Write a protein that binds this ligand. Structure first.
Ligand SMILES: OC[C@H]1O[C@H](O)[C@H](O)[C@@H](O)[C@H]1O
Ligand SMILES: [Zn+2]
Ligand SMILES: [Zn+2]
Ligand SMILES: [Zn+2]
Lengths: 675, 675, 675
């Protein structure tokens, strides 16, 4: 369990009584009890309230808060308050403030923007973390440390530049090695001294947010920035553990957030926690993929849903309300994919600057006789009823799809082949195909051991890191199926092209050679023409974005391009390799093809849908010992019916016994417990 | 009158003979008499020509211009020239130059961009105004002082920052009050010293033009900037009045210009003046609303139309010509809504940098045998014939629609609830409905005395200021009808939410509780379904953008939502309050709905259309003692006919008597004189 | 010949073995021989490899490269390496770095961005070019110097600003002349000292990249920046010629690149060279117009195609492949328009930062067995077979179309009359119309000797420079026909309006007075209505963007507007003027109209199509002594047939004799040799 002393799915979230008075806290306690809220994430944004100058600390206001919650037996997710520095610190110690992408030195304002290489910030953040831990080391109610808040954003100030040079000395050792890694013979970029190297932003190598002249420099700067923020986190973490070695530590992550390499971050964290904020507009399968990735960060360990909104989110272009039941629907989607808490931002609306129109459990009217409150209260009761049933349950997927931040960085900084190539979208296309057939799948790093899986899919694996090729050759040889696509295997970890023919280190295992890649103008497509009927694949399908022109070497040809000067050449190939098979998809296919492809690949390996359901009825499985829990989630606005099988199963949420045909209400959720 | 000395509608405008030679002034004079031009706005942009260093002043050039015009009995609207500082001043005294929103220190260029808190600028601006007024104090031709030119734009330099702190000390008195008003407990923003406070721009609290993290800081900085600039106006005004206590002083405004609180400005000005530049694209009823607002700034006092192009305006993306008759049509539209002058930019085209392709009376050919010149000459002659007839005439509207800049600021800085919420567009939806039925209406401030009205409409009155609620309650209880809408009554003057349920201070008078608001994605609409027929409203109409979900408390439900999860809940309510009524419109309705609503509200109060006319034939009224002047303006490219009433009346522009059926030419104008 | 020692169409391009090693260099030589590559452009980007500090120079690496190539008898286009400065130079001597349009001081990065007014850059760039020419002064293989690389971009630093003032003292002599040229009495812009003048960028007069308050300043600064970069070129050219006076010198230009006045550049260059990178999306007649313009830069002298990609270009939004044969098509298109070399970027792909997905002759596979390589080899073979046949061949066009950079700058900086006016687009509409009829045409400067032409077309000759009007009056009176359009003859060289009636100095020769100009909103059009059938022109056509409202004075009216208030007024006029004719086109007309107009004008002067061919089959002519080469180029993806005429002629490429009906394959090229 996330914490043995708190044996249920925690229910609560960000709570900020210091924005209010004592009387409102009385009301908070009363309404929290009504709603079933048993955890509070406190002290996220009160650095200034605690510390008014270099030497003065006041925790009495926090003591009162902890004590009051303790009387209710509400548990505490205690934040270190380092997510936003005090105005006096920004004024007296400007080294705390970032320099942005445009080269400007910032002034006090916003949040989440301390220079990760600031001596002042690291000095006081460490001291603050250590004082909190020390003061509260013996307190029974603290179940989790919430370090800082949403680490993110890049800094380009002098300290970062000086420290980037040091990071480079440690990474490359010599300028010779650095000059080679960066391919600096190009455009006369030869460096003769480390101080000659500067941060890549709008003043130097980069422009318009995502372009660069020197991708190796941009790539390493992102690695370095990610590491620098990670050092801040570890630094607070170690200071906390020194006083409370037994209290877990997390920090709140942001899913498919591009700027940080969370696989690397996750290793430093006791448990993953994240903040999920889908729009009305966000594909439901995408937010599943994100919860999935969050579980993948620690190779399938369950994570905390640290945040979500009980209703609207102010930051969205259109503050759409969550329709009746959707809040609950989406809470259970989170649990369905590994979440062992469901927590909100926030418990009571601010009044209150930029997030006053962010939804909360208790809102501006200040009472519980509210549609939003009712739904929250219903959920809370159900979470109480569930107790520890679902805790620690894990995924037993036999299909994995790989995702990597470094690969994403390189792809997004690349100049060509097409601005229409979107890495996450391509990964999502493959994942969506699995989600639609209820094939249980894991989002995994490229370093994950492949032996538990039967199908491994690596969409656009552009960057191939040391050991990767060997590991997939092994996987496939011993009977697995591996899938990869156009524009994969191009470069190594320094964004240097692996010479001798794409797909480089994967050429052997894929059995093909990709001669050249063609980018299609917007609105232009080609067509995948099957050689002959093959399982669920039959006739013609459309493809687009990029078209790899390839030569079957070892591999067999399953489909050919239908048009253009590479008409009749291979677009889908199958390589028999050892006891396994690898598939190379030379273009970006429509959803029908990926449906047939995924169906075939799963059948080939004897992996079966968890359940068959109408479109939009999502099924995911967590397993605890031998008991299988099937989360059935109906995203449709209408009631839906499906075959649940013949097994003796009971819906954990109704108590009723389910078998054969079963109906699920609109926005409905079932948790089928079997064996 | 604006000035007893000059008892007709002034005709002329911006005149810049100092760009030319003495010889062309002879031609200007000849053509001005031909055109009926009797007022010149001189010395707008010649600060540098006058003052070449800290100590030298040359007015001899201006003497000669003033004397030449006096020979023609042309009157003078004399500017102080402070609208653009000299290049030498920006060079020797950079404190005069602004720092922009991106945090950059500007160099010399442009105009209207002196730092309003600059010691140098204030020093020399005051001296210049003073020397100008002392020199010409006894001159018989000066009818108006024209301080500076279109004040506007924000500065973020150090002097403005330090004076922001002073302005805050004066506004709040203590840091305790400041921290509370700004809700600084949010994101650890507690200020312990005034110097910790910085200006909100891209370096600190704001981004991409209208976004902020701290709307309280951003709202106050806008107030501060507006006041700072206003102080510059007042400073020059006071110095002028020292020497010429009986010459009126104005400055030229920009209508619905967002950055300055013109209601505050107008209290400092003897008369309002403004610059009307409609695109081919602009709704005729919008520019009507704009003139109307300019009338409303001083509670119905007639205003000066200081500028408009006689033809094209270079600044428009497409320099569209005014079609034959349109210059005249638009001139009288200004007069119909309260202009006692019609003046142009400019009298002779420049040669000549960025405005050489801005229209003028006399243009690059240098002669009068010109379509544009003829139309100008024709107007001039009619204005001579009208004499003093219309001067000082006033609106007798029984219907008012409210507008407020501070309200607008808070709305435009709000994070949520919708980027498709546009305040001016909402105000204009209600105004347009009135305009279409020729219901005489006043744009008014939220402070205006309400007793004169029968119907008061306050669209999206998001911010409710001290005294506002009690004022509308008294108004309604005494027999008035009040209308407001979704997202009204939310905050106070500090953008702090009024707790306890929307619409807060207006909840008692509206008879409803607004529980939550839903933002519709673009292209999504809902339905207004009438519960029963009501006047001209029947059945179902569309609404969009935002849908408030409300509960009738004291109020009666007149229509319900037809779709979504709030289907069947109230969207239009009517609360009986004392002797009057208040209507709550919970969403943004289509034109058909608002047509019906407006007809009903007017009929309920016994207010009637001025006249019934075809679409695009606008009718507005000005009343002088016991005489009514109906301006009939046909915006259509085609002749139109209408029922002029049975009353005995003549058309001032033709002398003809009109009765019963009357036709008005394409682009034509009648001014009906009646009792 | 570009160089007598190398008597064929050169074939090769950018080559960068210093990114590689000796072994790969052996493969390069082997493959270059297979492909018939005989020229290498080396040392473009190796400043830092050569010079590691202020005092140290290493050329030994370059000696070896040059020797190795000399062994294969491959010729050298030797670059000075000044297009990208060393990181140490940027670090130690920041005066080398630019300040951008946003006022920001750049840091080390990118290329082509040394401050052209930098004492450090000029010092070391001169030395480097000197040492190279001295070291290789007796080397037989060097056939061309390649100074720097793609000069471009503007700088706004202190040194440029100060030097701007010096450049203005040279241009205008006195502040009095400056203030008049710039019209500074507008907006109190009077300058009393040169140091009061600042560079125009976002800090001063300009915004949004192309907008300005003071066009005179913006216009002059662009002249100045262009002049400053030209000075850099000349500085290196002179040092080179000091040591190798008989080796020709060029730098590589960018066609219709907006920022430099290439006409002025070309006078300083021994031969023009340029870099042709069309997208899949670029009109074929446009890239023809660009090659054409490059020929015109030196009044018909053949030029170098210095670059083009052999396949894809990474910089395009969509890296689309050149379809089979297209690389060859576009190479002969260059030759057809005056190119006496065909050279690539680059010979072997980098590995390697931002250009690794730029196409090359030898690519990442590293061998010749590739579609791209074979197409290169094939062309290489033909070029060998052509030998000296086409060299020095010239255009004998009877039709000219004028283009001018200063006119372009003034038009693009102008405030109004329409953001839908695009100078180059208009120039191209006229060029296209000729292109489609295979009428041989030269792009020319406004200063070209007009005597050799029969038809001279000047689309939107907004700026009229001294001597121009006289020159066209003389051309027309001697019997030529001249064509110009709406918005021509408006200003002089300082962007000051020529008063007294548009088109000012062109009013007599055009025989019309343009009274005013109307900008159409997007999607609005008007109608060109012919008075009577006239040659290929008949009935109605559409026109748009801008409509000049004009009066026929001496000119005959051939067509009138069909709609709007100017309906029935002239839109096409013909003025007889001496033995010649002038045509004024008062709007931007559709393609069918321009087809007819062009056909008429050409018949009138007895000028005839080279050949009649199907749509998309381009024909162009070069003439050498008594021999005419017709370049026939089929851009269609389908085989096409055409009457080749009855003459005795052979296809240079097949050796076959062609007469009467001939077919040409998809993407095909024929070069008909006739008399
Ligand atoms: O297409 C890329 C190409 O762009 C220009 O032509 C440059 O001169 C070359 O060095 C190369 O950068
Ligand atoms: Zn930093
Ligand atoms: Zn200021
Ligand atoms: Zn410079």
């Amino acid at each position: 369990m996330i914490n043995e002393k708190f044996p249920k799915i925690w229910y609560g979230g960000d709570y900020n009584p210091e924005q209010w008075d004592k009387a409102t806290m009385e009301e908070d306690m009363r309404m929290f009890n009504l709603a079933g809220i048993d955890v509070a994430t406190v002290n996220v944004f009160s650095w200034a309230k605690i510390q008014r100058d270099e030497v003065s600390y006041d925790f009495t206001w926090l003591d009162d808060i902890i004590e009051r919650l303790t009387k209710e037996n509400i548990y505490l997710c205690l934040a270190t308050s380092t997510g936003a520095h005090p105005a006096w610190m920004a004024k007296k110690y400007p080294d705390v403030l970032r320099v942005d992408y445009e080269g400007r030195k910032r002034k006090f304002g916003g949040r989440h923007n301390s220079c990760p290489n600031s001596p002042t910030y690291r000095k006081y953040a460490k001291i603050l973390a250590g004082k909190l831990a020390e003061r509260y080391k013996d307190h029974p109610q603290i179940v989790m440390w919430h370090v800082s808040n949403e680490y993110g954003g890049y800094c380009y100030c002098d300290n970062c530049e000086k420290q980037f040079r040091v990071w480079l000395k440690e990474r490359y050792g010599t300028l010779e090695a650095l000059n080679k890694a960066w391919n600096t013979s190009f455009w006369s970029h030869t460096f003769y001294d480390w101080d000659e190297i500067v941060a890549p932003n709008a003043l130097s190598e980069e422009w318009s947010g995502n372009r660069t002249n020197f991708q190796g420099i941009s790539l390493d700067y992102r690695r370095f920035q990610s590491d620098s923020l990670l050092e801040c986190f570890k630094m607070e973490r170690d200071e906390l553990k020194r006083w409370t070695p037994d209290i877990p530590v997390t920090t709140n992550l942001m899913g498919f957030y591009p700027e940080l390499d969370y696989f690397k971050w996750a290793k430093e964290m006791d448990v993953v926690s994240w903040d999920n904020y889908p729009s009305m507009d966000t594909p439901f399968s995408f937010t599943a993929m994100a919860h999935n990735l969050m579980r993948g960060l620690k190779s399938g360990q369950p994570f905390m849903l640290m945040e979500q909104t009980p209703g609207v989110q102010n930051w969205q272009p259109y503050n759409s309300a969550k329709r009746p039941g959707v809040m609950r629907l989406w809470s259970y989607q989170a649990v369905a994919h590994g979440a062992d808490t469901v927590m909100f931002f926030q418990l009571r609306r601010s009044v209150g600057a930029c997030e006053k129109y962010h939804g909360a459990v208790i809102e501006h009217v200040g009472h519980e006789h509210t549609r939003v409150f009712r739904e929250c209260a219903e959920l809370g009761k159900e979470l109480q009823q569930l107790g520890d049933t679902i805790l620690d349950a894990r995924s037993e997927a036999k299909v994995a799809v790989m995702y990597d931040w470094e690969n994403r960085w390189a792809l997004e900084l690349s100049s060509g082949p097409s601005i229409a190539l979107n890495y996450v979208n391509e990964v999502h296309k493959y994942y969506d195909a699995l989600y639609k057939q209820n094939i249980q799948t894991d989002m995994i790093s490229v370093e994950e051991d492949l032996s538990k899986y039967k199908v491994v899919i690596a969409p656009v694996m552009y960057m191939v890191k040391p050991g990767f090729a060997e590991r997939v050759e092994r996987f496939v040889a011993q009977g697995g199926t591996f899938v990869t696509t156009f524009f994969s295997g191009i470069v190594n970890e320094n964004d240097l092209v692996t010479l001798g023919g794409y797909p480089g280190e994967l050429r052997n295992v894929m059995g093909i050679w990709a001669e050249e890649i063609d980018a299609l103008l917007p609105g232009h497509q080609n067509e995948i023409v099957l050689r002959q009927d093959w399982g669920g694949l039959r006739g013609s399908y459309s493809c687009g974005i990029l078209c790899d022109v390839i030569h079957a070497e070892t591999a067999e040809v399953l489909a050919e391009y239908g048009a253009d000067y590479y008409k009749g050449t291979p677009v889908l190939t199958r390589n028999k390799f050892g006891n396994g098979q690898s598939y190379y998809v030379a273009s970006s296919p429509d959803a029908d093809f990926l449906q047939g492809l995924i169906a075939n690949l799963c059948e080939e390996q004897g992996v079966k849908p968890l359940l068959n359901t109408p479109d939009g009825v999502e099924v995911a499985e967590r397993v605890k010992n031998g008991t299988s829990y099937l989360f059935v989630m109906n995203h449709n606005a209408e009631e839906m019916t499906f075959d649940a099988g013949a097994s003796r199963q009971r819906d954990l949420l109704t108590g009723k016994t389910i078998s054969g045909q079963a109906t699920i209400p609109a926005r409905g959720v079932m948790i089928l417990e079997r064996a």
